[PDB]
């Protein structure tokens, strides 16, 4: 295994190093506004060395943005695809590339058989070529790598089944900045080449000057280069026709033949396209070839890529004709005039890359190596696209919830083969496709119109219900005696109970377990643990009595704590935000212990008085002018006091101190250690009153944030043996710090209300001597070193926080893990900050045509880990990566993949069993079974089950290793007949494995395996 910590890779371009050196001056470069006047030697190309030009027709089809997926399909995309089928069928030399398989599958299934056959023929013959082949072209900033892989697999599995093709070239022309997680996944999925477009205009200029726009993109920790993927970065401001023929858009616009008038389009540079004729083709070709030769100067080979397309292009039959016939006249002239020394033709993306690599192998060019990322993107001036790291945060959090529900549903149901009447495959396909659709770069990014966001939300709600149905049918089958199991595939044997989604204060969605002597004495509950190691976690349920005790199925008592159910209310009469307690529902909390990838059953039983093994939390409400707070049968009366500082400690965990406003002020790790200053603060950013306004995409603050005025907020302190917490009702945020014995959990119920033109940020202030360095993750996969640059504006120093961020000095580190992707930074030494929500009245001129005024309450969740790191073996000062400790990684897993909870619906569960998975291997902590998916329906004689195994890399800090069993996923199911290593999409077998054993993977590696069972 390669060492991902101690060996700094030697690359030609390292993006953090490049950023430190670049000046980012925004000077007017002439017609190429963000470049320079390109010059070329006319003698460079001659009869023995011609410029080969591939004009690649394309149509960017957003799966929802300003219309819903179905609205665009009916008004635009179905016409584009039907007319592409006809025009390619009738014009053999015409070509077209297609990226979004969600639309293609929607179209293809509605085609009659004769047309399906015609479509398969134009794909097989190379006229229509799929690029990437994912369900969507995903966002690369907020998306979790697991979901990027899920949507890639959904589109490519469809393409292999119906079109018999698997793309090896990727096309990503619209995500707002680019992540190295893409080449990571693509290179492990059979790809050979990729293309990107939205990178900072200063980066395009710098790389163009050095002819480094084509590069071998490797991961930041990869010393050898085995992860490398050839990448082409486009050079100009847009993928539209004016910015793809060459440097001067006033000239390129004249070659977009849809802009002459009858189509309702024109050239903003004021020179229209003119139909090509025999009287103007020489002058028109002179102009076009000059643009092409200038563009060719930015690259190393004699093969030039010229995309020809724009949003929802190639719809009308007349449009296909006007583009095709005019370009055919240009090619016939150009290719026949030896003096140009050019051979131009319509081509596909793969044809371009194949020709570039033929030139490379002929020794015509060598390509540079590169590592790093391409965030934060700016398309012009100071317009940095860091707003969408936070926009529509409710749905960003929903993405992570559904991510986990899909994983858990696929894993729980994979253990058995299911009759088609159970509709398992149907429900899982629906859930995978709705979550995959949301990975679109106008979905999770929060950059779609209001009604489109509603459509994504409805799709995701249906997907959550589908996952619940599959999960609960699976639990019932896995835990009922086989000869008793009698399923009704439409029945709800269990209800899922989720304490954090939509969340307390967001939706009252949880069911109360109703017990009583005159109705039901007890209730079975079941926990599932999707992770491949034994895990303990506190779990809670709502119950109708405080006198409840817990047992495991061997009837062993389990210690429990009961606390009230508190809800916060914005009292419009008293003008205060304060908590109300229920007098008939209570929370019972206990530690569940669950096998690796397994299930554990417990029983909740009511008694007439306090049970021996159940304790009750105390509650203290701090506020002036308190009123009573009765709690029914709850046995401890609520106490009141004036606001004051307080300190709490659960178990032998850290001791936390809080200000009189209910906000953390210090953490003391052990009884003898220092009270380390760690202060939470809420602030607000505004919008500029002159100049460009923030919107869904752009963050354009009117200076540093200002503190939110807190008033004298009401603070609630709950103290228990198993769980304690401090909650405070602040303007727009109910902030809660929860302690269970380790790093605290933070929950914010964020309701920005009607505060227009406001962004609310949560900041941590410490005295850690971090300087200008901080770390943020990329897609939940890796942590990358960031350097704050005071030569860039504040918004340029914001980066995606898809799952975590940290600052550190020689001795101390503070890591904040998140349960949702949000934007954040470290704007000063010792600080971390992360945006909670943003409400913007204005459109930001990127096509959306509205502000962001559809905010709704969202429950954001986090873990806050303060640790000593002086003994940790860390990368050297020049390494571009960072790595989590064991505690921080487990805290991230507690947020993203918690235990699932099931409440048995009926009164009696006949045939109930107490555990599943007790014999599953408990794998080393850095290994995860990211995906477990049965790949065959029940009719297949040979069943196949696919696994994606990911090993992260955790710092060595002196904690002895111990135990753990080797995990061989190929033997998790019985009767294994074959074990194969495959691409990550499961679509190609790469290795037949000896002894049917699937080896574990190296740190930072991801592999896929398929086991076959007789
Ligand atoms: O913004 S426009 O309507 O002018 O369209 C341009 C050119 O066709 C297009 O690039 C928009 Se891009 C398409 C959409 O996915 C994205 O949110 C937009 C970010 O600006
Ligand atoms: C699909 O795969 C290849 C395409 O090159 C071909 O040999 C094979 O006959 C095709 N068969 C199908 C599934 O149509
Ligand atoms: Zn787009």
Taking each helix axis from N to C end, the angle separating 78-90 and 101-110, rounded to the nearest 10 degrees, works out to 80
What was the resolution (in A) of this experimentally determined structure? 1.2
Cβ neighbourhood burial of 627 (10 Å; 0-12, 13-18, 19+): exposed
Residue having the nearest C-alpha atom to atom 12 of ligand 1 = 174
Report DSSP state, residue 76: I
Is the CB of 933 inside a 6 Å radius of any atom of ligand 1? Answer: no
Q: How far apart are CA 326 and CA 334, in angstroms?
A: 12
Q: Beta 733-739 vs 724-730: how paired, if at all?
A: antiparallel
Task: Yes or no: say if 366 and 188 are a contact pair by the CB < 8 Å rule.
Answer: no
DSSP states of 300-351: SSSEEEEEEEEET-S-SHHHHHHHHHHHHHHHHHHHH-GGG-EEEEE--HHH
Task: Report which ligand 1 atom has the smallest distance to the Cα of 60.
Answer: 13
Residue having the nearest C-alpha atom to atom 19 of ligand 1 = 846
Q: Beta 831-839 vs 303-311: how paired, if at all?
A: unpaired
Cis amide leading into 889 (omega within 30):
no
Of 164, 382, 458, nearest to 450 (Cα)? 458
Residue having the nearest C-alpha atom to atom 2 of ligand 1 = 847
Token pair recorded at residue 155? 């589109």
Task: Report which ligand 1 atom has the smallest distance to the Cα of 176.
Answer: 19
Give the number of whichever ligand sits closest to the CA of residue 173: 3
- From the annotation, which residues make up the binding site? 60, 62, 174, 441
Q: Do domains 493-617+898-919 and 920-1014 have the same CATH topology?
A: yes
Q: Which residue has the tokens 């996944």?
A: 185
Q: Hey, is 772 helix, strand or coil? A: coil
Is the CB of 59 inside a 6 Å radius of any atom of ligand 1? Answer: no
Q: How far apart are CA 273 and CA 770, in angstroms?
A: 56
- From the annotation, which residues make up the binding site for Zn(2+)? 60, 62, 174, 441
Task: Report which ligand 1 atom has the smallest distance to the Cα of 311.
Answer: 8
Runs of H (alpha helix) within 415-480: 424-438, 450-478
Is the CB of 62 inside a 6 Å radius of any atom of ligand 1? Answer: yes
CATH of range 382-492; options 1.20.1270.50, 3.40.50.620, 3.30.300.10, 1.10.10.10: 1.20.1270.50
Q: How far apart are CA 105 and CA 113, in angstroms?
A: 14
Of 820, 705, 825, nearest to 774 (Cα)? 825
419 phi, psi to nearest 5 deg: -60, 145
Token pair recorded at residue 692? 């460009």
Distance 846 CA to ligand 1 centre (A): 6
Give the number of whichever ligand sits closest to the CA of residue 445: 1
Token pair recorded at residue 232? 């082409």
Distance 443 CA to ligand 3 centre (A): 10
Is the CB of 311 inside a 6 Å radius of any atom of ligand 1? Answer: yes
Is the CB of 441 inside a 6 Å radius of any atom of ligand 1? Answer: yes
Of 141, 174, 236, which is best to mutate to test ligand 1, by the most ligand atoms within 8 angstroms of its C-beta?
Answer: 174
Distance 35 CA to ligand 2 centre (A): 46
Could you tell me which CATH number the domain at 618-897 has?
2.70.98.30
Q: How far apart are CA 557 and CA 615, in angstroms?
A: 13
Task: Report which ligand 1 atom has the smallest distance to the Cα of 239.
Answer: 10
Residues ≥6 apart with Cβ < 8 Å to 730: 577, 661, 662, 682, 708, 710, 713
Q: Which residue has the tokens 């899982």?
A: 428
For the chain, the structural domain boundaries read 1-381, 382-492, 493-617+898-919, 618-897, 920-1014
Distance 160 CA to ligand 2 centre (A): 10
Q: Beta 831-839 vs 804-808: how paired, if at all?
A: unpaired
Q: Tell me the C-alpha to C-alpha distance, in Å, between residue 329 and each of 250, 282, 474, 625.
A: 21, 10, 63, 84
Q: How far apart are CA 305 and CA 550, in angstroms?
A: 67
Beta bridge partners of 932: 947
Distance 316 CA to ligand 1 centre (A): 20
Task: Yes or no: say if 101 and 135 are a contact pair by the CB < 8 Å rule.
Answer: yes
Task: Yes or no: say if 868 and 888 are a contact pair by the CB < 8 Å rule.
Answer: no
Beta bridge partners of 559: none
Residue having the nearest C-alpha atom to atom 20 of ligand 1 = 846
Distance 698 CA to ligand 1 centre (A): 14
Q: Residues with catalytic annotation?
A: 174
CB half-sphere exposure, 695, CA atoms < 13 A: 18
Distance 159 CA to ligand 2 centre (A): 12
Other C-beta atoms lying within 10 Å of the C-beta of residue 798? 26
Q: Tell me the C-alpha to C-alpha distance, in Å, between residue 294 and each of 288, 523, 708.
A: 10, 75, 53
Give the number of whichever ligand sits closest to the CA of residue 697: 1
Residue having the nearest C-alpha atom to atom 4 of ligand 1 = 847
Runs of H (alpha helix) within 733-802: none
DSSP states of 212-274: -SEEEE--TT-SS-TT-EEEEE--SS-SSGGGTSSS-HHHHGGG-GGGSSTTS---TTS----
Obtained via which technique? X-ray
Of 523, 528, 497, 522, nearest to 600 (Cα)? 528
Q: How far apart are CA 446 and CA 725, in angstroms?
A: 32
Own/partner long-range contacts of 551-555 (Cβ < 8 Å, ≥24 apart): 551/602, 551/603, 551/605, 552/600, 552/601, 552/602, 552/603, 552/914, 553/601, 553/602, 553/603, 553/912, 553/913, 553/914, 553/915, 554/914
Residues ≥6 apart with Cβ < 8 Å to 218: 9, 11, 183, 225, 227, 228, 229, 369, 370, 371
Of 174, 847, 849, 850, which is best to mutate to test ligand 1, by the most ligand atoms within 8 angstroms of its C-beta?
Answer: 847
Distance 167 CA to ligand 1 centre (A): 25
Token pair recorded at residue 820? 């949702």
Token pair recorded at residue 193? 């080449």
Cβ neighbourhood burial of 18 (10 Å; 0-12, 13-18, 19+): middle
Q: Tell me the C-alpha to C-alpha distance, in Å, between residue 102 and each of 136, 176, 526.
A: 6, 20, 36
Give the number of whichever ligand sits closest to the CA of residue 166: 2
DSSP states of 819-840: SS-EEEE--STTEEEEEEEEEB
Task: Report which ligand 1 atom has the smallest distance to the Cα of 238.
Answer: 10
Is the CB of 900 inside a 6 Å radius of any atom of ligand 1? Answer: no
Is the CB of 846 inside a 6 Å radius of any atom of ligand 1? Answer: yes
Is the CB of 256 inside a 6 Å radius of any atom of ligand 1? Answer: no
Is the CB of 844 inside a 6 Å radius of any atom of ligand 1? Answer: no
Report DSSP state, residue 483: T
Q: Tell me the C-alpha to C-alpha distance, in Å, between residue 599 and each of 9, 505, 534, 880.
A: 43, 29, 10, 40
CATH of range 493-617+898-919; options 3.30.230.10, 3.40.50.300, 2.60.40.1180, 3.90.550.40: 2.60.40.1180
Is the CB of 447 inside a 6 Å radius of any atom of ligand 1? Answer: yes
Task: Yes or no: say if 214 and 193 are a contact pair by the CB < 8 Å rule.
Answer: no
Q: Tell me the C-alpha to C-alpha distance, in Å, between residue 55 and each of 320, 334, 352, 808.
A: 14, 13, 9, 50
Could you tell me which CATH number the domain at 920-1014 has?
2.60.40.1360
Q: Which residue has the tokens 């014009």?
A: 91
Residues ≥6 apart with Cβ < 8 Å to 283: none
Of 243, 846, 849, which is best to mutate to test ligand 1, by the most ligand atoms within 8 angstroms of its C-beta?
Answer: 846
Report DSSP state, residue 1000: P
Give the number of whichever ligand sits closest to the CA of residue 160: 2
Q: Beta 706-707 vs 676-685: how paired, if at all?
A: antiparallel
CATH of range 1-381; options 3.40.50.300, 3.40.50.12160, 3.20.110.10, 3.90.650.10: 3.20.110.10
Task: Report which ligand 1 atom has the smallest distance to the Cα of 441.
Answer: 15
């Amino acid at each position: 295994c390669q060492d991902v910590v101690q060996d700094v890779p030697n690359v030609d371009v390292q993006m953090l190093e490049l950023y430190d050196r670049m000046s980012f001056k925004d000077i007017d470069g002439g017609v190429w506004k963000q470049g320079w006047n390109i010059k070329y030697d006319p003698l460079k190309y001659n009869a023995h060395h011609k410029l080969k030009v591939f004009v690649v027709p394309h149509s960017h089809n957003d799966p929802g943005w300003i219309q819903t997926f179905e609205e665009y399909y009916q008004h635009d995309t179905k016409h584009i695809l039907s007319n592409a089928l006809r025009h390619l069928h009738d014009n053999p030399e015409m070509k077209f590339i297609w990226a979004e398989i969600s639309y293609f599958a929607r179209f293809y299934h509605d085609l009659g058989e004769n047309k399906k056959l015609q479509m398969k023929s134009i794909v097989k013959n190379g006229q229509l070529e799929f690029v990437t082949g994912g369900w969507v072209m995903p966002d690369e900033a907020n998306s979790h790598w697991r979901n990027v892989l899920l949507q890639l697999t959904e589109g490519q599995t469809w393409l292999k089944q119906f079109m018999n093709v698997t793309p090896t070239a990727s096309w990503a022309i619209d995500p707002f900045g680019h992540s190295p997680t893409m080449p990571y996944i693509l290179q492990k999925s059979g790809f050979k080449n990729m293309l990107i477009q939205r990178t900072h205009y200063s980066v395009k200029k710098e790389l163009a000057q050095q002819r480094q726009l084509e590069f071998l993109w490797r991961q930041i920790w990869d010393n050898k280069g085995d992860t490398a993927l050839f990448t082409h970065m486009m050079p100009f401001y847009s993928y539209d026709i004016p910015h793809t023929c060459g440097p001067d858009p006033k000239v390129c616009c004249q070659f977009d033949f849809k802009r002459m008038g009858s189509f309702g389009l024109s050239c903003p540079w004021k020179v229209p396209p003119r139909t090509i004729s025999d009287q103007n083709v020489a002058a028109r070709s002179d102009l076009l070839v000059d643009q092409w030769k200038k563009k060719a100067e930015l690259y190393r080979t004699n093969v030039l890529l010229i995309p020809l397309g724009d949003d929802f292009r190639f719809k009308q039959n007349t449009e296909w004709d006007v583009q095709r016939v005019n370009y055919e006249r240009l090619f016939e002239h150009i290719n026949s005039q030896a003096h140009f020394n050019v051979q131009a033709q319509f081509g596909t993306l793969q044809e371009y890359f194949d020709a570039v690599h033929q030139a490379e192998r002929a020794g015509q060019a060598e390509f540079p190596t590169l590592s790093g990322d391409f965030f934060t993107y700016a398309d012009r001036s100071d317009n940095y696209w860091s707003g969408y790291y936070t926009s529509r945060p409710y749905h960003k959090r929903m993405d992570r919830v559904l991510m986990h529900y899909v994983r858990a549903a696929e894993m729980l149901s994979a253990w058995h083969s299911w009759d088609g009447m159970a509709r398992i495959e149907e429900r899982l396909e629906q859930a995978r496709r709705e979550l995959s659709l949301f990975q679109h770069h106008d979905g999770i990014t929060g950059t779609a119109k209001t009604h489109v966001v509603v459509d994504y939300e409805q799709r995701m709600q249906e997907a959550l219900k589908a996952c619940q149905m599959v999960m609960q049918q699976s639990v019932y089958r896995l835990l009922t005696k086989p000869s008793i199991y009698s399923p009704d595939f439409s029945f709800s044997y269990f209800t899922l109970d989720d304490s954090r989604w939509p969340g307390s204060g967001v939706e009252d969605s949880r069911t109360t377990i109703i017990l009583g002597e005159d109705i039901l004495p007890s209730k079975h509950v079941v926990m599932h643990n999707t992770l491949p190691h034994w895990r303990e976690q506190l779990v809670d349920f709502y119950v109708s009595s405080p006198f409840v005790s817990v047992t495991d199925l061997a009837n062993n008592p389990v210690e429990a704590q009961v606390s009230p159910v508190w809800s916060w209310h914005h009292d419009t009469l008293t003008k205060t935000i304060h908590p109300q307690g229920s007098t008939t529902k209570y929370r019972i909390i206990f530690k569940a212990r669950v096998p690796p990838m397994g299930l554990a059953t417990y029983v909740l039983t009511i008694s007439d008085s306090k049970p021996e093994h159940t304790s009750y939390a105390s509650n203290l409400l701090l506020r002036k002018n308190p009123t009573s707070l009765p709690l029914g049968q709850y046995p401890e009366d609520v106490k009141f006091g004036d606001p004051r500082e307080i300190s709490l400690r659960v178990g032998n965990g850290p001791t936390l101190a809080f200000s009189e406003q209910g906000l953390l002020k210090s953490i003391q790790l052990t009884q003898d250690s220092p009270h380390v200053p760690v202060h939470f603060k809420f602030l607000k950013y505004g919008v500029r009153s002159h100049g460009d306004r923030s919107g869904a995409y752009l963050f354009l603050p009117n200076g540093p944030a200002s503190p939110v005025e807190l008033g004298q907020p009401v603070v609630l302190v709950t103290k228990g043996k198993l769980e304690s917490s401090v909650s405070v009702g602040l303007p727009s945020v109910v902030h809660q710090t929860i302690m269970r014995g380790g790093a605290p959990e933070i929950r914010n119920l964020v309701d920005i209300g009607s505060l227009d033109n406001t962004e609310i940020v949560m900041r941590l202030e410490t005295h850690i001597d971090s300087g200008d360095i901080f770390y943020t993750d990329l897609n939940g996969l890796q942590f990358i070193k960031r350097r704050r640059l005071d030569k860039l504006p504040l918004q340029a120093n914001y980066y995606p926080i898809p799952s975590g961020m940290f600052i550190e000095d020689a001795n101390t580190r503070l890591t904040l893990l998140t349960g949702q992707p949000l934007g954040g930074s470290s704007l000063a030494s010792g600080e971390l900050e992360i945006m909670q929500d943003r409400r913007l009245a204005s459109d930001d001129e990127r096509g959306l045509g509205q502000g962001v005024l559809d905010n709704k309450p969202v429950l954001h969740i986090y873990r806050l880990v303060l640790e000593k790191v002086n003994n940790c073996v860390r990368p050297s000062k020049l390494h571009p990566a960072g790595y989590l400790t064991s505690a921080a990684h487990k805290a991230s897993q507690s947020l993203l993949d918690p235990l699932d909870k099931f409440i048995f619906a009926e009164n009696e569960w006949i045939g109930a069993q107490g555990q599943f998975g007790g014999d599953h291997p408990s794998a080393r902590e850095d290994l995860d079974v990211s995906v477990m998916r049965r790949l065959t329906k029940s009719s297949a004689k040979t069943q196949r089950v696919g696994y994606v195994l990911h090993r992260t890399n955790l710092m060595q800090c002196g904690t002895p290793e111990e135990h753990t069993q080797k995990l061989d996923v190929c033997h998790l199911l019985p009767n294994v007949a074959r074990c194969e290593r495959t691409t990550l999409t499961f679509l190609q077998n790469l290795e037949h494995l000896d002894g049917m054993v699937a080896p574990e993977v190296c740190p930072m590696e991801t592999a896929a395996y398929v086991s076959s069972h007789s």
